[PDB]
């Protein structure tokens, strides 16, 4: 199928190319940072079977910006537009393009500071694993007919 690690790596690489601030995945590193660090995680995954062999996946991906130094909220408002410019229609992961159904963003205060939370959802259909027995071609067909 398609691996979540690959999606996370692709998004992290895009952010690395387009921004100069560091990108972290675990909370300890963002706590230990000196300031202006990103945070990337996969919020939730929902799987529903629509066919015998295929599932339907909705993945919500969360991006966080936490500016530590004072008077950097204007930097957050600048960064919002640059983030918006990248994730418009679809992204390409392992020679496959996945749609982006909607974008959501909110500015809320966490603990003692305000943070920016940028989210979007991916929708695509994927196939479950199965094992198929191999049969050889038909060679002899016996047909006996009676009363």
């Amino acid at each position: 199928m398609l691996k979540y690690k690959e999606i996370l790596e692709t998004i992290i690489e895009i952010l690395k190319k387009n921004f100069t601030e560091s990108i972290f995945i675990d909370d300890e590193s963002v706590q230990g940072s000196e300031g202006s660090c990103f945070f990337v995680s996969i919020l939730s995954v929902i799987c529903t079977p629509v066919m015998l062999n295929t599932n339907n996946k909705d993945i919500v991906i969360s991006i966080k910006y936490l500016p530590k130094p004072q008077s950097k909220s204007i930097r957050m408002y600048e960064i919002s537009d640059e983030l918006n410019k990248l994730f418009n229609r679809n992204i390409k992961v392992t020679d496959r393009k996945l749609n982006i159904t909607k974008l959501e963003q909110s500015i809320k205060k966490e603990e003692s500071i305000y943070v920016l939370n940028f989210t979007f959802t991916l929708n695509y259909l994927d196939s479950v694993y199965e094992e198929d027995v191999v049969y050889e071609n038909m060679k002899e067909i016996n047909l006996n007919l009676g009363e």
Partner: protein, 136 residues
């Protein structure tokens, strides 16, 4: 005891397996006439025949229906097909198959789409005779 779930459903149309199928349904509706017999309050009925009706629902993966019937419909000759439905839930004890013959489709959907919605196609049909395989 378990009731068969429809997730384990497969359909063969015209000898080709239909990979994408959301649901399948086929029914036989009888024709009856009211008959009133002198001296009896209750009303009885006489059976005169039956009609076969059904429909399919499948995702718009490819242009199957057009390649099936489009040119022949314009030319003036109506084709007939045979469909096979199989329902085999592993929890249940046995499987069930039905052969539906002399199928004719009611309509054709050239194109249908909307912003933010995955395409779906449903095609009703009418049949005449059926045959039963692997009865439970």
């Amino acid at each position: 005891r378990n009731v068969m779930s429809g997730t384990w459903g497969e359909l063969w149309l015209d000898g080709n397996k239909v990979a994408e199928v959301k649901k399948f349904q086929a029914k036989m509706e009888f024709t009856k006439e009211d008959i009133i017999i002198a001296g009896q309050m209750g009303t009885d009925t006489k059976y005169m025949g039956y009609k076969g009706k059904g429909s399919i629902t499948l995702y718009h993966v490819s242009s199957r229906m057009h390649k099936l019937i489009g040119e022949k419909i314009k030319r003036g000759s109506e084709p007939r097909f045979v469909a096979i439905s199989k329902l085999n839930d592993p929890d249940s004890y046995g499987a069930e198959r039905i052969a539906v013959k002399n199928i004719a489709f009611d309509d054709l959907t050239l194109a249908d789409w909307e912003v933010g919605v995955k395409g779906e196609i449903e095609a009703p049909f009418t049949f005449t005779e059926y045959d039963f395989l692997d009865i439970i």
